[PDB]
Structure 1
Amino acid sequence: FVNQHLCGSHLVEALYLVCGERGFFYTPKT
């Protein structure tokens, strides 16, 4: 696959894609 900049809603879209059913956490403060 590739490496792109994934920001904002696009990041969370990517997480949704990658993780799907497993779910994910989006935690920008870290």
Structure 2
Amino acid sequence: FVNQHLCGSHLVEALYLVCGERGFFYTPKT
């Protein structure tokens, strides 16, 4: 695997990919 820039909808898409059934949180304010 690699390291790239992941922003916006694309970042949340990658969170879905990696976390799936575990679920996740997206908190940009954090």
Do they fold alike, i.e. is TM over 0.5?
yes
Q: CA deviation at 1:6?
A: 0.1
Shift of 1:23: 0.3
Task: Give structure 2 stretches of 5+ with no counterpart.
Answer: none
Which 4+ residue blocks in structure 1 deviate beyond 4 angstroms? none
Instruction: Give me the TM-score of the superposition, normalised by structure 1.
Output: 0.97
Query: Percentage identity across aligned positions?
Result: 100
> Structure 1 stretches of 5 or more lacking a match?
none
Name the counterpart of 1:11.
Answer: 11
Aligned length: 30
